[PDB]
Structure 1
Amino acid sequence: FQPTNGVGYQPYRVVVLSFELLHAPATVCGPKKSTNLVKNKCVNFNFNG
């Protein structure tokens, strides 16, 4: 690599995130804040994604 090289020859840093979805208990989650649980009621639910 050289700083005067073209855009195709410039460095590019690549991070590849690999993950499995909804097949195992989860140790990492998103920004959504959890609310209180409601039992025996027709309600939209988001359990562990």
Structure 2
Amino acid sequence: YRVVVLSFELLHAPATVCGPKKSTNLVKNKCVNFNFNGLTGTGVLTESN
């Protein structure tokens, strides 16, 4: 029986491994809840120059 022991260390250190952050589609010109890299908000996204 091939066996692997994974030991995770969550201590006082800058975290290096994390679960992937999945996303959804991006919709503009509409009032929407947005979350960009942890920045949360509610508003209308429009093309900015």
TM-score of the two chains, using structure 2 as the length reference: 0.37
Between structure 1 and structure 2, the one with the greater Rg is 1
- Tell me: higher relative CO, structure 1 or 2? Use CA pairs within 8 A at least 6 residues apart: 1
Scaled by the length of structure 1, what TM-score is found?
A: 0.37
| More strand as a share of residues | 2
